[PDB]
Design a protein around this ligand. Structure first.
Ligand code: 5ZY
Lengths: 194, 247
């Protein structure tokens, strides 16, 4: 498919961390993370892209996701840090087995310690879910850096903090995937400071 | 986009020529209109109603623009919803008022509206009959013979001897039971409240309340939206309610 370009690779413990530029629906990781809302309504953003790539129809993957959410949490909504796991379906041909749905906070141009802790849990949650299931590779989008309007540099910094604080032996590869080139250059600068 | 005002000379004309057919307006200097918004956004056992904060602000500023003093109550149990309504019914400013608005927004079932702690195995429901009974002619004398407008947005999906004709008078309820499907677009909230505010802003200067509600319904009279058509319920008004914005 379209070009996947690794811009940075380093070891955080035994975990190999990569920063890549491209489409997360084409990244070769056993699990990819969705920047969802609390209802798993995949109506726009990377959520719509993942839902359509998995099921052909984004509305179908929304219903599949809502069924999984009730089965896994006993309710029809999730909070920051909680992760719903759904089959990747059509994405299996690219080596992706699961979608991990996470929900970041809505900054809307602001930033606070409350917003950071919510975004931190939304990044750490999928890492801990991968460790619980023995999933060896996981790829992340820039959760909350798009429609929810959190500053990209703060998002990438919070992501790196979750990776550095994560403790796990099953997870061997973590990737952050940025679509547009300008935001990927911003993320690379943050990666190199840290 | 703001509330269009009715000129004062048309306010005196309609009050004089069609006095027997419209609800009387209290003189603005001694008038103390009261309105109440009860909105449940967060629930213990139900999905959150995102966008409700924009609906609260929109409805509050619309009612204040219609010269109502608006009390706002948020995230109440069914017990406390009933207590707030009974307290609102006893307010003395109603004696110096000509009308009132009640705006109730939450999850709903067929028989009533849900409180914050509702669950299907342990229900927390304020029955609709309890709402009308609290404000009827026997229990709320300060609003007797005065129009009582009840706007209800009760999203379905929360659960997976006619003394009434004599006492329940001058009510009108405008109800939307659409399941909560608000988009996660900052510029707006629910489509029902957005259309309600827009039609009030455009038509309150020339149309009475029932005509404004029909303008809202007309905006849903299209194939993609007709399933969500809001309904007029428990109508007991004896006259037309002209808001006369700005008067
Ligand atoms: N219904 C919905 O469910 C989701 C959530 O509610 C909400 C979360 O927002 P989020 O957390 O900021 O995540 P985003 O997707 O916006 O961006 C996340 C970041 O990944 C980038 N990126 C986009 N594509 C790809 C891709 N293929 N590969 C790799 N990276 C990709 C973006 O450039 C960005 O940098 O949006 C969704 N949404 C629409 C609601 C908006 C509408 N109501 C109008 O307001």
């Amino acid at each position: 498919g379209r070009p996947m370009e690794v811009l940075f690779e380093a070891k955080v413990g035994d975990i190999t961390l990569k920063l890549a530029q491209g489409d997360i629906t084409q990244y070769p990781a056993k699990a990819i993370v969705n920047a969802a809302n609390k209802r798993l309504e995949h109506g726009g953003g990377v959520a719509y892209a993942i839902a359509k790539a998995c099921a052909g129809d984004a509305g179908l993957y929304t219903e599949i996701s809502k069924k999984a959410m009730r089965e896994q949490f006993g309710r029809d909504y999730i909070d920051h840090g909680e992760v719903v796991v759904t089959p990747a379906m059509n994405l299996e041909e690219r080596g992706i087995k699961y979608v991990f749905h996470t929900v970041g906070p809505i900054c809307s141009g602001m930033w606070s310690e409350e917003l950071k802790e919510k975004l931190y849990k939304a990044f750490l949650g999928p890492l801990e879910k991968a460790e619980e299931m023995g999933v060896e590779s996981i790829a992340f989008p820039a959760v909350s850096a798009g429609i929810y309007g959190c500053d990209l540099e703060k998002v990438v910094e919070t992501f790196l903090e979750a990776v550095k604080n994560f403790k796990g032996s099953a997870v061997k590869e973590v990737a952050l995937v940025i679509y547009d080139r300008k935001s990927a250059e911003v993320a690379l600068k943050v990666f190199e400071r840290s | 986009d703001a509330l269009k005002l009715c000129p004062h000379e048309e306010f005196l004309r309609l009050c004089k020529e069609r006095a027997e057919e419209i609800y009387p307006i209290k003189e603005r200097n001694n008038r103390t209109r009261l309105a109440l918004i009860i909105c449940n956004t967060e629930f213990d056992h139900l999905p959150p109603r995102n966008g409700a904060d924009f609906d609260i602000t929109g409805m509050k500023e619309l009612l204040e623009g219609l010269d109502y003093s608006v009390d706002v109550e948020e995230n109440l149990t069914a017990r406390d919803m009933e207590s707030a309504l009974r307290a609102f019914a006893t307010r003395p400013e109603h004696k110096s008022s000509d009308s009132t608005f009640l705006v109730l927004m939450s999850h709903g079932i067929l028989e009533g509206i849900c409180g914050t702690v509702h669950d299907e195995k342990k229900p927390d429901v304020l029955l609709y009959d309890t709402i009308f009974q609290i404000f009827n002619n026997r229990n709320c004398l300060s609003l007797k013979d005065k129009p009582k407008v009840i706007i209800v947005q009760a999203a379905r999906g929360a659960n997976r001897a006619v003394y009434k004709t004599h006492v329940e008078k001058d009510f009108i309820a405008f109800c939307s039971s659409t399941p909560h499907n608000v988009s996660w677009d900052s510029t707006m909230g629910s489509i029902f409240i957005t259309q309600l505010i827009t039609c009030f802003q455009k038509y309150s200067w020339c149309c009475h309340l029932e005509e404004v509600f029909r303008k809202v319904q007309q905006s849903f009279e299209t194939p993609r939206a007709k399933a969500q058509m809001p309904t007029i319920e428990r109508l007991s008004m004896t006259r037309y309610f002209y808001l006369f914005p700005g008067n």
